[model samples]
Target: GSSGSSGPGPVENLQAVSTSPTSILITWEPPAYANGPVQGYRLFCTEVSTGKEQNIEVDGLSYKLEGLKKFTEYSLRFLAYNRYGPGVSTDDITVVTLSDSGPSSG
Candidate 1:
């Protein structure tokens, strides 16, 4: 912790565990280096087609996002920070939502 002159390091290995037309289960790991004390984490889910973003705050390394449109692609990322405010951000993790309807059984 370099006196936290700068914000904390960013999260890493962010990925989607499961996805659906209306939800997404996400996971991630701590940054390789903390650099400073961590306060909490913030996640951003962006709808690629519409370029709309949603905000989420997580206490742990995983999150389940709801209220998403079916058949849409979402780009997710995380931001690490402390009292000093936000720090570095994780690389975008993109995933497509599941369709509302499944394959019809013949």
Candidate 2:
């Protein structure tokens, strides 16, 4: 029998941010025990309102997501993949884009 524990456990230091109301960025570091080298990472985003899903591949440890509607809530997930296959996914996170305010009160 073949064991399923070949690659590293999972990557860490996952972080996400919203550069603007319609853009989101995600970043993470490589797993500790990656055999040779990491090819890339995959980022998944879902629009909770419309049930729309988007998958993106990033060559580096970070990526920026755009074309999102304002004031919509989104769920994000990430995974590290090598030549073998996709590894475990990180903890799921949710975020909402900032809505437009009537006016500033400075």
Candidate 3:
């Protein structure tokens, strides 16, 4: 019979950094308790202005996303998963991409 085991815990230190007008970098640490072998990670993002959603899967601690909207705000979080199941998602972190042109001041 199988022993005691469960899904992983939430990811740690989830962070987002805008790298360019159309790109962003997302990073996070592994879950506090990986009940089983960590399989991969899930990165979820939502466009604040449009309410569009995107979910990405990766096997590394950091990932760079491209083709994002310039000067748009994105809310992001990470989820760790294993053979058991997916863990709780990290708290949402928000960031805005840089504008192609310089900032406008009144």
Candidate 4:
């Protein structure tokens, strides 16, 4: 492997699944071209309806997003990075959380 170091490459197979009325679980694999040891990952979440956005950083392959609007759509993107700098980001993925009430409540 080349000793040269730079920002990490984009992660692959990024996915987001809503697990509750106000939460989502995002998972991904490490970048194919990790320039160096990956230091962390940056995630960008945007609410489709209101254009509200949130940014979070983590050191794991998955993250659990909380406190989101129920039954609303959100777009998510991820970027893998090393100590060098931020790298290419993944394509945006959309997900909608579950509704407030269960079917049995109707």
Error of 2 at 1 (Å): 14
Q: Put down candidate 2 lDDT per residue, 1-106, tens digits, no spaces.
A: 6454444446778888787878777778888866555677878888899897888777787777878888788898887777666777777668787666677889
Models 1 onward score TM values of 0.78, 0.81, 0.81, 0.81
Report the poorest 10 consecutive residues by lDDT, candidate 2. Answer: 1-10
Candidate 2 — what's its lDDT? Answer: 0.76
Candidate 1: tens digits of C-alpha lDDT, residues 1-106: 6564577786777678446678888877778787666777888889899888888788887788888877776798778877787877777877788887868898
Residues 6-98, model 4: lDDT tens digits? 678888777889888999888888767678767878888899998977887776777888989989888988888777777777778888888
Assess each prediction's global lDDT (C-alpha) against the native: 0.78, 0.76, 0.79, 0.82
Candidate 3's residue-wise lDDT over 1-106, tens digit each?
Answer: 6665566888777778986888888878876666767888877789989887888787788888898888887888787788777777677778888889867798
Model 2 alpha-carbon miss at residue 80, Å = 0.3
Model 4 earns a TM-score of: 0.81
Looking at model 1, the pairs that clash are 20-98, 21-98
Model 2: residues >4 Å from true position, as ranges?
1-8, 102-106
